[PDB]
Amino acid sequence: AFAVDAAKAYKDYLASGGQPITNCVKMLCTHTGTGQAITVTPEANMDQESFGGASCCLYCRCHIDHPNPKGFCDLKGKYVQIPTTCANDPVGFTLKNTVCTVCGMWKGYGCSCDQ
């Protein structure tokens, strides 16, 4: 029942003081967007940067199978918004954080559905 867990391998490489994956495609935008995590068009707000989805996907970048039964990708063809404070490692940010299913913002980075 073997299978390569790349998400864990990258986190272990980051904790080991490794260099984050670079060349993530940062987009030009007004920075007056919704602030939602993954969008069809850049929706960065003043506290965020928008990136090309494919360039921020660990699976797409390492050319390995996606952890989705049909081998489908969430980021490819979309735009992922990353807090300006974490834009130094967008791939690592998408692996560690979760998208709120009711408002669409990142958990603990905009999602306020818990108040």
The rounded Cα 66 to chain-centroid distance in angstroms is 14
Q: Which residues contact 46 (CB under 8 A, 6 or more apart)?
A: 31, 32
With respect to other proteins, which residue has the nearer C-beta, 41 or 98? 41
DSSP state of 19: P
Q: How far is the CB of 46 from Zn ion (least distance, A)?
A: 19
By the criterion CB under 8 A, which residues form the site for other proteins?
23-30, 40-42, 49, 52-55, 57, 60-61, 63, 76-79, 87
The yes or no reply on residue 103 touching Zn ion (CB under 5 A) is yes
Q: Is 73 annotated as a binding residue?
A: yes
What's the CA dihedral at 81, 65, 17, 88 to 10 degrees? -20
With respect to other proteins, which residue has the nearer C-beta, 33 or 110? 33
